[PDB]
Design a protein around this ligand. Structure first.
Ligand SMILES: Nc1nc2c(ncn2[C@@H]2O[C@H](COP(=O)(O)OP(=O)(O)O)[C@@H](O)[C@H]2O)c(=O)[nH]1
Lengths: 175, 76, 76
């Protein structure tokens, strides 16, 4: 041996949307240390169970630097589910979510599973992006959307388990 | 140019086909190399964190044990 | 009729270039993946140490209190 599946996932988005905490909360680390700041890549493993089976999730978190342009394509191209992540505290993050959707469409694969993750939903008092307007983006592009707090610990575990179910249901279809 | 266009559109068509065939090969080996880099870098991160955690795990025990004596001196 | 030939290599001309440009890229990949993998691996290593270092630095200073700050308890 167990596991019995391996999903490769990717986190992408504007810097400081909190991509990296969103991870660190899912993978369950006790600590803050990461290489995202300095390198622009970090990585985490977590196996979960879904309808009984072991599912190993490899989660890459990418931060765009052009420094490693080639390598990070390799992650896009090889990714099974990618989470697009904005800050509801910040518009352009949300505006860019389209831009990323480009990359994903342009650099990544033709059937990839996709999920818009509206992060920091906890801090409503600094809230510039309406959720309603969040869902509409998603629905336009026919992708799932979800509001999320790496810090209040809201919907992060669900966001992943949901994306993992979506990956598996697709693969079980090719029995 | 009936024989010129019926000839060249065989060579030109082949070029696109030759490359089509050449593309899959080029893109096959780019995906193959990318997996191998995935699993390589997967291991390096996994260790790098593994190492760094243990350097922090001890730092906590030492500092933890110091709060165990540091509060009783500041209590009095 | 006489415009159907112009519809082919207006299209083809734009097609050939596409693939020919695709490969130019797809060929440099194996070297970039390596020439990146390296940089990464270094960066990883470098940072990996820095983190472990800091951790230890603080294991020291938070143990010199157990020998010098406990001596302050032994001197009071
Ligand atoms: N309030 C709030 N702050 C967050 C959240 N996620 C991250 N942050 C903070 O926002 C900043 C960006 O998060 P970070 O992990 O660097 O994401 P990244 O820069 O996109 O990889 C940091 O200062 C985090 O402390 C969140 O969900 N809510």
């Amino acid at each position: 041996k167990t596991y019995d599946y391996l999903f490769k996932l990717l986190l992408i988005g504007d810097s400081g949307v909190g991509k990296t905490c969103v991870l660190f909360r899912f993978s369950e680390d006790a600590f803050n240390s990461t290489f995202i700041s300095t390198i622009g890549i970090d990585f985490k493993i977590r196996t979960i169970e879904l309808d009984g089976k072991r599912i190993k999730l490899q989660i890459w978190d990418t931060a765009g630097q052009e420094r490693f342009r080639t390598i990070t394509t390799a992650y896009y191209r090889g990714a099974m589910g990618i989470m697009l992540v904005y800050d509801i505290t910040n518009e352009k993050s949300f505006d860019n979510i389209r831009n990323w959707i480009r990359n994903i469409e342009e650099h990544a694969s033709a059937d990839v599973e996709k999920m818009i993750l509206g992060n920091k939903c906890d801090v409503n008092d600094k809230r510039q992006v309406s959720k309603e307007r969040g869902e509409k983006l998603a629905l336009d592009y026919g992708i799932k959307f979800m509001e999320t707090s790496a810090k209040a610990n809201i919907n992060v575990e669900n966001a992943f388990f949901t994306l993992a179910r979506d990956i598996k249901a697709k693969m079980d279809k090719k029995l | 140019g009936y024989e010129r266009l019926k000839e060249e559109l065989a060579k030109a068509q082949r070029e696109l086909k030759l490359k089509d065939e050449e593309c899959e090969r080029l893109s096959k080996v780019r995906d193959q190399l990318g997996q191998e880099l995935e699993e390589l870098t997967a291991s390096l991160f996994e260790e790098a964190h593994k190492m760094v955690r243990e350097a922090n795990i001890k730092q906590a025990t030492a500092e933890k044990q110091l709060k165990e004596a540091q509060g009783k001196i500041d209590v009095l």
